[PDB]
Amino acid sequence: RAAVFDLDGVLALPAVFGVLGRTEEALALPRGLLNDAFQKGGPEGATTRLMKGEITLSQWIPLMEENCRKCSETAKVCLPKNFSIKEIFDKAISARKINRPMLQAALMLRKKGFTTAILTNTWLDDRAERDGLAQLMCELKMHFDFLIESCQVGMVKPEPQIYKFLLDTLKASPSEVVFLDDIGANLKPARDLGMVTILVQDTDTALKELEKVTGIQLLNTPAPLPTSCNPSDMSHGYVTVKPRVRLHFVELGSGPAVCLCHGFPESWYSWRYQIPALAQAGYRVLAMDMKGYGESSAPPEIEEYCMEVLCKEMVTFLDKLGLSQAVFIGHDWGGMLVWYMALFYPERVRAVASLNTPFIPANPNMSPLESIKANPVFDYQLYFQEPGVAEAELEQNLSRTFKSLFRASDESVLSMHKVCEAGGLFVNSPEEPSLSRMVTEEEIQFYVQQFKKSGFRGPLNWYRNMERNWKWACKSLGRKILIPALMVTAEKDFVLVPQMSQHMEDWIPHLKRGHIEDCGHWTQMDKPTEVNQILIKWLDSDARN
Amino acid sequence: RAAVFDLDGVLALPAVFGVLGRTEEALALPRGLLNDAFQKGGPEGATTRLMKGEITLSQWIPLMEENCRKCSETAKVCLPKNFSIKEIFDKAISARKINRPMLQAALMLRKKGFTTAILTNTWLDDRAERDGLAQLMCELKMHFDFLIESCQVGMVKPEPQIYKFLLDTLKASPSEVVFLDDIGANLKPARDLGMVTILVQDTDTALKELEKVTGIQLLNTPAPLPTSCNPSDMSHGYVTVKPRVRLHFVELGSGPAVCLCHGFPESWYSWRYQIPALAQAGYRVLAMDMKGYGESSAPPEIEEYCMEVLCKEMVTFLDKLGLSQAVFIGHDWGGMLVWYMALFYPERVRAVASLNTPFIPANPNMSPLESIKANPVFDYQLYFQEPGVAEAELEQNLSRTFKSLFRASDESVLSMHKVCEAGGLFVNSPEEPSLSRMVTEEEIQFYVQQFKKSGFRGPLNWYRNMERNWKWACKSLGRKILIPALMVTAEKDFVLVPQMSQHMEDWIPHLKRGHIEDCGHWTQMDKPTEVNQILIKWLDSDARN
Ligand SMILES: CCc1cc(-c2cccnc2)nn1-c1ccc(NC(=O)c2cccnc2)cc1
Ligand SMILES: CCc1cc(-c2cccnc2)nn1-c1ccc(NC(=O)c2cccnc2)cc1
């Protein structure tokens, strides 16, 4: 089964075709005059040539300028001194947006096994503002299995040839697919060839007919999750910052650089929902694979994981990447690394942002080891001190480990209070936890194959530099974070709760704040929508500048 | 032996310190009033604290504001309503540039084995315009083995502690190093500790003393070559565009995306001189490792190397990278791929640029095979047709092959005219060619280890799609390149000479042009300075926009 959507008028908001009407009324010009010059000599038409990619857009514009000296001429009329078919067409273009509900449907059908695709008559945009269309094209193109373009296949919508073509590339028979257009003309062929057809008068009904003809709920359906990241379609980057330390990241998007530092014990994958989203927002995302995790080198020494070297290494990463700075957004430990980054390398930090992790100054008087036994929640933080031990029960059964950790506040199957005495973090938990409702079985077998590499020693050593991380931290007792910084708290996070971050103003005067109720500790995978909403809003005004 | 240069006043142009003088004269304020408030309570001084990184710049500004209510107060004076120590300091900062001749010296000494480094009193720039300094810091930082910063080591210039420190990290004794400062105070310590010292009054003499004390020619020395790329300090990127086709590129710089498509039979390394340079120019360079070369997949099928699939693959590369478009700059074949890119995917091409390779329309009447036997120079183009053959003598001895090809116009050891009949391209050449004067023995053993991977079949298949590349090329006989495009020709190129490109205007109306006389076929490594000069000038006004 399949589904083909025309771009204009089905996935594109104000279907360009319409403008020659709109425009016409505005200048009060002879009804239909325009959408008449747009279609001269049927096939010999300038428009059709453009359709077939024989001429560039910039070429066709003038041939359409002319008709508008012949189309208005025969109907005994006249036109304004500077009649911009160019200007009128830019606006129309820049004006079309995505038909969100429609895209939502094509996404669903794919989701429930449908080879979706776009069949569309299109020109070869060589305009000076081509990038805008090319930009939207990307957003859409991305969610479809195929994207057939007239100017690319030298065939145009009506010709039954393109259909046989589309039907070919679609490895399917007419009777297995639907076809939605806003043009009767192009539709007959589908129907006169087999495939179910739907005239897209109004979206609301189109989908009404669609969900109908498919027995799949497409309309007024639950607000979906942002786009996740397929680890195979990602651009994987590498940088060797030191002799035995290579760093892996994932790159997507262009524009201001946004470095994402995940937490413990995750990967660059933890941001699966904010990577496509932020990239789309107008940023260049670099989803860090922190030191010790997955594809990044994972040396044994406990010391190689203190914030000081972790931070000198992040700069080194910027350096070898040719970046003056970047906006570091962090989580869990990633959040701590970030606070220090803004505390020791302001120049290099355009904007600071942490999720859950609070900027807490260091207590020169009480050593962290002490000052941490001074908190119930932080009991597992003890059980992590003896190299070898924690590695053990964690590296014991990767699947079990992640299905146990990556659990919502309520879903829990652990209780980090009294663990050492408990003799393990999984002591009283099922050796086969039920799947969390935040993650699919696949998303888990992914963190499984990742940790199969360097294990849990590298990750467990971040917890093993208390004394060091504290000492270096005192050097910055006089400092003050005056760069754009955001502190985002989660209601149901139990180990890193909102309260801890309440005094962050005394150190960060202009600290903005975000909060997310009914939100666990794995912020990214639990409340992606909010997270993206909150970080994009902040990025537009506090970072980008 | 070693060399340490202070940043300000030695590597930085208008040594900031000076401004408190400049500024003072302007507002006609009591001589020395400023450079007096800049230094209150010796060590307890706000300035010193900043030096030691105890306070951020944004913090110190106000403590310096004040002094200027006490420094002018005791000398019974007054100051203007809005006396911006802030504004005065931004300008001074943004104003300092690199002391090119000085950097040139530190570069030489390293070049002739010298562990060079920067010892400098510096603050922690958290200003709102910090990025500018951080930006220059990068340009410099990059050319020095070490970069000691006061605010990072909690030690400041005068304290003999920092010296013992610098001398420590420098794994050397005072008597083996020189130290150049613009401040006597900080210098005594070096001298009173051993190391040769030089007060940098005027650069001209400093170096005069320097080249002296080193017996190394540092002044009025030959204009050097732009920065080359060390393949180990590069950020290596990967993208799988197809099932069995992964693509490797090198990334450096931020800003507009600039894709570099090398030629035959080179690598991403061919742009070694334009990568650091362009990155520095304000661009994000993606030095492509073309299909079939080095780190990119290299499948056998001759067909997988026609322009059509090579181009659909480049877009796919853009897509998975989150780029709406990019500026494709190409060379040799890389130049051809680019012309087609702008001919079939305008939207995706921000700017077109080719070096040596001319945009030549396709002759529908005469088949390329014919129309190419119709040219002497293109005789080796025949010898490349039979799969297996060319691979052979080329893969025979990698070193010999590249030392023979990568030779200037005059250096030549080949003669591509009459080769098939000659029975090989190396038939009458030394089996141990002398090194070209354009490349070091290392730069060659690099292309050697690269071709050790997929060999010369992938590269030789680009030449094996004449009929196809031509047919697809006819579809675009009506087209017209109206996007920003540059055509750069080389005087001594013999196979792809300037003349071929003379009619490029009829197809590219606004085609700009560059030429480089006394320039071979390996444009990039032969005339890097010009190349960078010509492409950066064009990029600023034709692409960036
Ligand atoms: C066994 C570890 C664990 C289980 C669960 C869990 C399980 C089931 C249900 N819900 C939650 N959450 N966590 C966890 C991980 C990292 C941190 N972060 C830090 O310890 C930390 C420390 C210092 C700075 N930043 C972060 C805090 C808590
Ligand atoms: C054996 C090959 C060779 C030797 C020398 C050489 C040797 C010694 C001294 N000087 C020069 N130059 N070339 C060479 C390589 C690629 C091309 N490009 C193309 O053939 C081409 C074809 C079609 C489109 N674009 C480029 C043209 C010429």
| Nearest-angstrom CA–CA distance, B129 and B58 | 11
Matching residue, tokens 């120590």: B85
> Helix crossing, A57-70 with A85-95: angle to 10°?
120
**Nearest by CB: B237 against A154, A237, A480:** A237
DSSP code string of B124-171: ---STTHHHHHHHHHHHHTT-SEEEEHHHHT--TTSHHHHHHHHHHTT
Edge-first strand order for the sheet with B196-199 is: B146-149, B115-120, B2-5, B177-181, B196-199
Locate B278 and state its tokens. 């362009």
Q: Is the CB of B425 under 6 A from ligand 2?
A: yes
List of residues 6+ apart from A128 with CB closer than 8 A: none
Matching residue, tokens 């995978």: A525
Q: Is the CB of B309 under 6 A from ligand 2?
A: no
| Nearest-angstrom CA–CA distance, B515 and B534 | 9
Please give, rounded to a whole number of angstroms, the shortest distance from the CA of B129 to a CA of chain A: 9
What residue owns the CA closest to ligand 1's atom 4? Answer: A405
What ranges in A294-348 are assigned the alpha helix state H? 307-321, 333-344
| Nearest-angstrom CA–CA distance, B85 and B16 | 13
| Nearest-angstrom CA–CA distance, B133 and A346 | 11
What ranges in B173-332 are assigned the alpha helix state H? 188-191, 203-214, 274-281, 307-321
Contacts of B319 in chain A (CB under 8 A): 138, 141-142
Cβ contact A56–B239 (<8 Å): no
DSSP state of A202: -
| Nearest-angstrom CA–CA distance, B68 and B78 | 9
Contacts of A279 in chain B (CB under 8 A): 322
Which has the closest alpha carbon to B399: B431, B367, B360, B372? B431
Tell how strand A245-252 and strand A284-289 pair up. antiparallel
Q: What are residue A332's phi and psi, to 5 degrees?
A: 55, -115
Expressed in angstroms and rounded, the spacing between residue B459 Cα and the centre of ligand 2 is: 12
List of residues 6+ apart from A388 with CB closer than 8 A: none
DSSP state of A251: E
Q: Is the CB of B538 under 6 A from ligand 2?
A: no
Cβ contact B324–A135 (<8 Å): yes
| Nearest-angstrom CA–CA distance, B281 and B540 | 9
Determine if the peptide bond prior to A299 is cis (ω within 30°). no
* Cα Rg, chain A, nearest whole Å: 29
Exposure string over A117-129, b if 16+ CB within 10 A, otherwise e: bbbbbbbbbbbee
Which has the closest alpha carbon to B327: B112, B100, B539, B48? B539
State how far Cα B470 lies from the chain centre: 35
Inter-residue contact A210 to A202 (CB < 8 Å): no
| Nearest-angstrom CA–CA distance, A225 and A218 | 15
Tell how strand A115-120 and strand A2-5 pair up. parallel
Q: Reduced to 3 DSSP states, what percent helix, strand and coil does chain A have, rounded to the nearest 5?
A: 45, 15, 45
Inter-residue contact A4 to A179 (CB < 8 Å): yes
Locate B415 and state its tokens. 């003669």
Give the ligand 1 atom nearest the CA of A381: 20
**Nearest by CB: B478 against A54, A285, A321:** A54
Kind and range of the H or E element at B450?
helix B441-451
**Chain B residue whose CA is closest to A229:** B320
What ranges in A170-254 are assigned the alpha helix state H? 188-191, 203-214
| Nearest-angstrom CA–CA distance, B474 and B456 | 29
Locate B81 and state its tokens. 């309503």
User: E strands of B253-378, at which residues?
Assistant: 257-261, 284-289, 326-331, 349-355
> Helix crossing, A466-474 with A307-321: angle to 10°?
70
| Nearest-angstrom CA–CA distance, B384 and A371 | 74
Inter-residue contact A241 to A268 (CB < 8 Å): no
- Measured from the alpha carbon of residue A266, the closest ligand is 1
DSSP state of B413: -
Pairs of residues, one from chain A and one from chain B, whose beta carbons lie less than 8 Å apart:
167
What residue owns the CA closest to ligand 2's atom 25? Answer: B333
Burial of B235 (0-12, 13-18, 19+ CB in 10 A): buried
Inter-residue contact B59 to B124 (CB < 8 Å): no
Question: CA dist A118 to A51, A114, A140, A170, B311, Å?
Answer: 15, 13, 9, 11, 21
Matching residue, tokens 């480089």: B516
Locate B61 and state its tokens. 């500004």
Edge-first strand order for the sheet with A196-199 is: A146-149, A115-120, A2-5, A177-181, A196-199
Contacts of B480 in chain A (CB under 8 A): 55-56, 58-59, 126
Question: CB neighbours (10 Å) of residue A246?
Answer: 15
Give the ligand 1 atom nearest the CA of A416: 1
Sign of CA dihedral A375, A381, A383, A385: negative
Q: Is the CB of B264 under 6 A from ligand 2?
A: yes
| Nearest-angstrom CA–CA distance, A175 and A184 | 19
Inter-residue contact B339 to B359 (CB < 8 Å): yes
Inter-residue contact A489 to B65 (CB < 8 Å): no
Q: What are residue A285's phi and psi, to 5 degrees?
A: -85, 135
Kind and range of the H or E element at A239?
strand A235-242
Which has the closest alpha carbon to A87: A37, A15, A23? A23
| Nearest-angstrom CA–CA distance, A513 and B507 | 56
**Chain B residue whose CA is closest to A251:** B321
What ranges in A377-465 are assigned the alpha helix state H? 380-383, 389-396, 398-405, 441-451, 457-460
Sign of CA dihedral A530, A533, A536, A539: negative
Which has the closest alpha carbon to B519: B488, B542, B481? B488
Way the structure was solved: X-ray
Sign of CA dihedral A405, A410, A413, A414: positive
> At residue A404, what is the residue type?
S
Chain breaks in chain B (C to N over 2.5 A) after: none
Matching residue, tokens 């006609």: B28
Q: What are residue B27's phi and psi, to 5 degrees?
A: -80, 10
**Chain A residue whose CA is closest to B346:** A126
Cβ contact A134–B237 (<8 Å): no
Burial of B346 (0-12, 13-18, 19+ CB in 10 A): buried
Please give, rounded to a whole number of angstroms, the shortest distance from the CA of A370 to a CA of chain B: 26
Cβ contact B350–A253 (<8 Å): no
Burial of B399 (0-12, 13-18, 19+ CB in 10 A): middle
> Helix crossing, B441-451 with B398-405: angle to 10°?
120
Please give, rounded to a whole number of angstroms, the shortest distance from the CA of B50 to a CA of chain A: 10
Domains and CATH numbers, chain A: 1-14+95-215 (3.40.50.1000), 15-94 (1.10.150.240), 234-545 (3.40.50.1820)
Q: Which residues of B are catalytic?
A: 332, 463, 521
What residue owns the CA closest to ligand 2's atom 22? Answer: B333
Question: CA dist A191 to A121, A185, A194, A213, B197, Å?
Answer: 19, 11, 5, 14, 89
| Nearest-angstrom CA–CA distance, B42 and B352 | 59
DSSP state of B369: H
User: Ligand 1 test: best mutation among A267, A332, A410, A419, most atoms within 8 Å of CB?
Assistant: A332
Q: Within 13 Å, how many C-alpha atoms sit on residue A346's CB side?
A: 28
Contacts of B59 in chain A (CB under 8 A): 478-480, 482
**Nearest by CB: B240 against A232, A324, A482:** A232
State how far Cα B83 lies from the chain centre: 41
DSSP code string of A45-90: -HHHHHHTTSS-HHHHHHHHHHHHHHTTTTTT----TT--HHHHHH
Locate B142 and state its tokens. 């990059």
Kind and range of the H or E element at B400?
helix B398-405
Q: For testing the chain A interface, which of B55, B58, B59, B126 should be mutated: the one with the most A CBs within 10 Å?
A: B126
Helix (H, G, I), strand (E, B) or coil at B485: strand
> At residue A438, what is the residue type?
M
Which has the closest alpha carbon to B279: B313, B228, B241, B338? B228
Locate A346 and state its tokens. 């302001």
